[PDB]
Scaffold this active site. Structure first.
Site, PDB file in Angstrom:
ATOM      1  N   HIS A 121       3.818  11.003   6.153  1.00  0.00           N
ATOM      2  CA  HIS A 121       3.299  10.588   7.429  1.00  0.00           C
ATOM      3  C   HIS A 121       4.415  10.062   8.267  1.00  0.00           C
ATOM      4  CE1 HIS A 121      -0.981  10.208   5.888  1.00  0.00           C
ATOM      5  NE2 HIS A 121      -0.634  11.433   6.194  1.00  0.00           N
ATOM      6  N   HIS A 157       0.641  -1.176   0.014  1.00  0.00           N
ATOM      7  CA  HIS A 157       0.075  -0.070   0.134  1.00  0.00           C
ATOM      8  C   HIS A 157       0.833   1.149   0.000  1.00  0.00           C
ATOM      9  CE1 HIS A 157       0.172  -0.145   4.606  1.00  0.00           C
ATOM     10  NE2 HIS A 157       0.163  -1.474   4.330  1.00  0.00           N
ATOM     11  N   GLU A 179      -3.561  13.212   1.302  1.00  0.00           N
ATOM     12  CA  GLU A 179      -4.608  12.634   1.911  1.00  0.00           C
ATOM     13  C   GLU A 179      -5.651  13.911   2.614  1.00  0.00           C
ATOM     14  OE1 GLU A 179      -3.470   9.186   4.314  1.00  0.00           O
ATOM     15  OE2 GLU A 179      -4.238   8.110   2.586  1.00  0.00           O
ATOM     16  N   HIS A 225       2.065   8.891   0.746  1.00  0.00           N
ATOM     17  CA  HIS A 225       0.932   8.680  -0.198  1.00  0.00           C
ATOM     18  C   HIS A 225       0.990   9.664  -1.272  1.00  0.00           C
ATOM     19  CE1 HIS A 225      -1.404   6.772   3.198  1.00  0.00           C
ATOM     20  NE2 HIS A 225      -0.609   7.470   3.903  1.00  0.00           N
ATOM     21  N   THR A 235      -5.455   6.320   8.309  1.00  0.00           N
ATOM     22  CA  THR A 235      -6.093   6.401   7.020  1.00  0.00           C
ATOM     23  C   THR A 235      -5.907   5.138   6.369  1.00  0.00           C
ATOM     24  OG1 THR A 235      -4.264   7.320   5.920  1.00  0.00           O
ATOM     25  CG2 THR A 235      -5.333   8.835   7.148  1.00  0.00           C
ATOM     26  N   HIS A 288       6.172   6.872   6.160  1.00  0.00           N
ATOM     27  CA  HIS A 288       5.722   6.490   4.617  1.00  0.00           C
ATOM     28  C   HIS A 288       5.198   7.578   3.986  1.00  0.00           C
ATOM     29  CE1 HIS A 288       2.060   6.125   7.154  1.00  0.00           C
ATOM     30  NE2 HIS A 288       1.609   6.519   6.037  1.00  0.00           N
TER      31      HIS A 288
HETATM   32  N1  Q3H Z   1      -1.590   6.527   7.164  1.00  0.00           N
HETATM   33  S1  Q3H Z   1      -1.506   6.385   8.516  1.00  0.00           S
HETATM   34  O1  Q3H Z   1      -0.369   7.224   9.074  1.00  0.00           O
HETATM   35  O2  Q3H Z   1      -2.723   7.101   9.229  1.00  0.00           O
HETATM   36  C1  Q3H Z   1      -1.269   4.721   8.872  1.00  0.00           C
HETATM   37  C2  Q3H Z   1      -0.478   4.479  10.308  1.00  0.00           C
HETATM   38  C3  Q3H Z   1      -0.403   3.057  10.588  1.00  0.00           C
HETATM   39  C4  Q3H Z   1       0.408   2.538  11.631  1.00  0.00           C
HETATM   40  C5  Q3H Z   1       0.667   1.194  11.939  1.00  0.00           C
HETATM   41  C6  Q3H Z   1      -0.563   0.512  12.984  1.00  0.00           C
HETATM   42  C7  Q3H Z   1      -0.648  -0.770  13.192  1.00  0.00           C
HETATM   43  B1  Q3H Z   1      -1.574  -1.497  11.794  1.00  0.00           B
HETATM   44  B2  Q3H Z   1      -2.584  -2.992  12.613  1.00  0.00           B
HETATM   45  B3  Q3H Z   1      -2.219  -2.836  14.333  1.00  0.00           B
HETATM   46  C8  Q3H Z   1      -1.103  -1.643  14.584  1.00  0.00           C
HETATM   47  B4  Q3H Z   1      -0.301  -3.052  14.759  1.00  0.00           B
HETATM   48  B5  Q3H Z   1      -1.412  -4.111  13.369  1.00  0.00           B
HETATM   49  B6  Q3H Z   1      -0.878  -3.307  11.731  1.00  0.00           B
HETATM   50  B7  Q3H Z   1       0.102  -3.131  13.052  1.00  0.00           B
HETATM   51  B8  Q3H Z   1       0.152  -1.941  12.167  1.00  0.00           B
HETATM   52  B9  Q3H Z   1       0.555  -1.864  13.972  1.00  0.00           B
HETATM   53 ZN    ZN Z   2      -0.319   7.719   5.705  1.00  0.00          ZN
END
Ligand code: Q3H
Ligand code: ZN
Length: 258
Positions: free
Chosen positions: A117, A62, A104, A94, A196, A92
């Site tokens: 971000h 993604h 975004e 977008h 997001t 990361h």
């Molecule tokens: N676009 S954004 O910046 O809003 C995105 C941020 C995502 C951060 C990661 C969160 C997670 B996802 B699910 B639960 C947590 B544990 B499992 B997978 B692992 B990753 B960590």
């Molecule tokens: Zn993001």
């Protein structure tokens, strides 16, 4: 249908697997600059990245992400609208298929070419999995990218993207300094929102910097060579990996600046 950004699995489908997609504090949002209120009680943001330890760069299907050692308080966000200390986990981006879209958040409906971000989690909850279950668990620092002059501090990232073209690929990415991605001003807007991307958890204090960074056309063109797909599957450019603006509902966006 594992989620994505296409016609059949994109943002308007996400609510079927993640019903909170239609929740009360979803991100991103349009920042209406005239309605955001200056809050003279908001503190300057404290960004302490001098001891940051980058580890790996990864194509996760993604976006691509640079991951950091978050086992100690080495790269932390504090102050601003935050209580306590938030550790940098990863950053990361977008981006769009063309320069007129990719961000975004939007500003008075203006879309930027990309959005960075920097994702941090509240040390009081001990790990990021626990933090995403809390309304103040994460703080995401959002930075807009416009196309113009090159960002030197981004080049080390751009140059290894050829080695992580497809979903699953990763590479060593040590000694990367994220200070090189920051604009001059730390003036910001803040509001309560969400991840997001799935699972769209409502756990984020958003901190969106007013000042964009400039990157070159050649830098953003390298983003657009990445693939959503795994190696050996039909090639589908990783472009337009942005969620559109969501309803603000009962939220106030506050500005750190007049
Ligand atoms: N676009 S954004 O910046 O809003 C995105 C941020 C995502 C951060 C990661 C969160 C997670 B996802 B699910 B639960 C947590 B544990 B499992 B997978 B692992 B990753 B960590
Ligand atoms: Zn993001």
């Amino acid at each position: 249908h594992h989620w994505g950004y296409g016609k059949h699995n994109g943002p308007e489908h996400w609510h079927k697997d993640f019903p909170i997609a239609k929740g009360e504090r979803q991100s991103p949002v349009d920042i209406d600059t005239h309605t955001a209120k200056y809050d003279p009680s908001l503190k300057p943001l404290s960004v302490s990245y001098d001891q940051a330890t980058s580890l790996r760069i990864l194509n996760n299907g993604h976006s691509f992400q640079v991951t950091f050692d978050d086992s100690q308080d080495k790269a932390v966000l504090k102050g601003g609208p935050l209580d306590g200390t938030y550790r940098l986990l990863q950053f990361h981006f977008h981006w769009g298929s063309l320069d007129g879209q990719g961000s975004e958040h939007t500003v008075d409906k203006k879309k930027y070419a990309a959005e960075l971000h920097l994702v941090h989690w509240n040390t009081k909850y001990g790990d990021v999995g626990k933090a995403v279950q809390q309304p103040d668990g994460l703080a995401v620092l959002g930075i807009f990218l416009k196309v113009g002059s090159a960002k030197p501090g981004l080049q080390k990232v751009v140059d290894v993207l050829d080695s992580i073209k497809t979903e699953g690929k990763s590479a060593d990415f040590t000694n990367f300094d994220p200070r090189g991605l920051l604009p001059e001003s730390l003036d910001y807007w803040t509001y309560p929102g969400s991840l997001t991307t799935p699972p769209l958890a409502e756990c984020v204090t958003w901190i969106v910097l007013k000042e964009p960074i400039s990157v070159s056309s050649e830098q953003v063109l390298k983003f657009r060579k990445l693939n959503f797909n795994g190696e050996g599957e039909p090639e589908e450019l990783m472009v337009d990996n942005w969620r559109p603006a969501q309803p603000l509902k009962n939220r106030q966006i506050k500005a750190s600046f007049k």
